[PDB]
């Protein structure tokens, strides 16, 4: 039986177990995907356990950074981003990848949103780094903003981007919220409605609530919008493909995710 | 999803397509595995195509050794052996493994042939290196012979084994023909009949004909014998698990191979 799991702390609310359960059944495969709470302290012992009993696992906070060292091989993309969210186990060896970047890209495409920059990424943290990398490689112009201006300038330098002031948002065609503003805060948004571009599209990686103020304002302003679920569904479907070579229907992955959310 | 192939020059009558067709089917999986003729000079281009459309491929003569330089990662064992018979493609990256070595040991085990040395491996070439590596790993005392003395001597120094003259076959308890002598030639055998021990076991990697002159001599001497089909099946099965995480029935694959030989 294929044995999978998500390791992180917390993981009690991960939507991965539900999605992959659907992947397994939909693809007629026998196996399981379990949520396994793993504080940074247990990472070492947990991986050794992975080397011997799991075909693969996903990593969520707070393990994504300190995992690279314990692996036998890390993807170039995962090395630059500096985070690994998907681990593959073959012959007792552990290989690390980052399905968030490609998942994000495939989500937009599938969602119907033509890539068409310049693109602006709000937040220069973990989520921001991943998304910033992805859009560059796709062939779009990319700017970055962050609460604390420092973190922004550096990233623009490391990835070869532009750290712009929040105001510049008006000149972009692709807006991406990589901050926690809005998370379980229906009335909060990182971007003032007046600073919204006249045309384009916006994507929020925060999916709790599903329709954040950011996306509601963006929708009201005429921009095309996409919730955070599609990306979640694609990174998951891509991870599964990595593990077995079979791609579960991303739509079915998203639906499984929504049902789990109850929205 | 799941498109494999055996890359070699020649591969016209490979039994892999047959075994793997059975693997996929027996596992209720959709996919294909075809023989793709590939000369040495055509392999740089082949691997690029692999990265864009194949989940994985097996490599045969004369690509197994030249392949290493064109891969993103190569297993410690494959590196030591110096040859890759199994390649896995993930996110466009190529990883090389060797399922010949572990496959050989499983084959012996399943076939009811316990590890008892000294083990004499005939042929210090590629196939010989894989078998010698495996037997050393298993802790047996390993001897090696080669028509060209130098190659056997070099290999013995390299792996910490002992190069010996054919006459030492009389003291070996496990004999393995890893040479091409006898291939489609019922009159040829790498070991003169009078040098066969009178107890032990004999395995021939050559399976065309199935009952080589070598195996007929060993069987006539009362040695327990094994054809090359079991190893062929196991290296394929292990490769399949490498690619998908699922282990197809080795006996079923050997059977599929047999029926594909016309025997």
Swiss-Prot record, chains A, B:
Keyword NADP appears in the UniProt entry: yes
One GO CC term, this protein: cytosol
Record keywords: Amino-acid biosynthesis, Aromatic amino acid biosynthesis, NADP, Oxidoreductase
Amino-acid positions noted as binding shikimate in the UniProt annotation, renumbered to this chain: 14-16, 60, 85, 100, 207, 235
Catalytic machinery residues: 64
Residues holding NADP(+): 123-127, 146-151, 205, 228
Top EC class for this record: oxidoreductase
Cross-referenced Pfam families: SDH_C, Shikimate_DH, Shikimate_dh_N
Pathway connected to this protein: Metabolic intermediate biosynthesis; chorismate biosynthesis; chorismate from D-erythrose 4-phosphate and phosphoenolpyruvate: step 4/7
GO molecular function, one term: shikimate 3-dehydrogenase (NADP+) activity
Record-linked InterPro entries: Aminoacid_DH-like_N_sf, NAD(P)-bd_dom_sf, SDH_C, Shikimate_DH, Shikimate_DH-bd_N, Shikimate_DH_fam, Shikm_DH/Glu-tRNA_Rdtase
Subunit structure: Homodimer.
Function noted in UniProt: Involved in the biosynthesis of the chorismate, which leads to the biosynthesis of aromatic amino acids. Catalyzes the reversible NADPH linked reduction of 3-dehydroshikimate (DHSA) to yield shikimate (SA).
HAMAP family on file: Shikimate_DH_AroE (MF_00222)
Family: Belongs to the shikimate dehydrogenase family.
Designated name of the protein: Shikimate dehydrogenase (NADP(+))
């Amino acid at each position: 039986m294929l044995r999978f799991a998500v390791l992180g702390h917390p993981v009690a609310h991960s939507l991965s177990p539900a999605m992959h359960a659907f992947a397994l059944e939909s693809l007629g495969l026998e196996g399981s995907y379990e949520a396994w709470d793993t504080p940074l302290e247990a990472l070492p012992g947990r991986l050794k356990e992975v080397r011997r009993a799991f075909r693969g696992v996903n990593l969520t906070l707070p393990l994504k950074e300190a995992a690279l060292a314990h692996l036998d091989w890390v993807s170039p993309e995962a090395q630059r981003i500096g985070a690994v969210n998907t681990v593959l186990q073959v012959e007792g060896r552990l290989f690390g990848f980052n399905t968030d970047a490609p998942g994000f890209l495939e989500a937009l495409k599938a969602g119907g949103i033509p890539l068409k920059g310049p693109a602006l990424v709000l937040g220069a943290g973990g989520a921001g780094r991943a998304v910033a990398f992805a859009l560059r490689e796709a062939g779009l112009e990319v700017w970055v903003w962050n609460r604390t201006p420092q973190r922004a300038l550096a990233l623009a330098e490391e990835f070869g981007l532009r750290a712009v002031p929040l105001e510049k948002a008006r000149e972009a065609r692709l807006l991406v919220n990589a901050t926690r503003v809005g998370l379980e805060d229906p009335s909060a948004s990182p971007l003032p409605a007046e600073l919204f571009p006249e045309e384009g599209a916006a994507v929020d990686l925060v999916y709790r609530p599903l329709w954040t103020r950011f996306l509601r304002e963006a929708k009201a302003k005429g921009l095309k919008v996409q919730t955070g679920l599609p990306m979640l569904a694609w990174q998951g479907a891509l991870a599964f493909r990595l593990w077995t070579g079979l791609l579960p229907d991303p739509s079915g992955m998203e639906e499984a995710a929504r049902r789990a959310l109850g929205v």
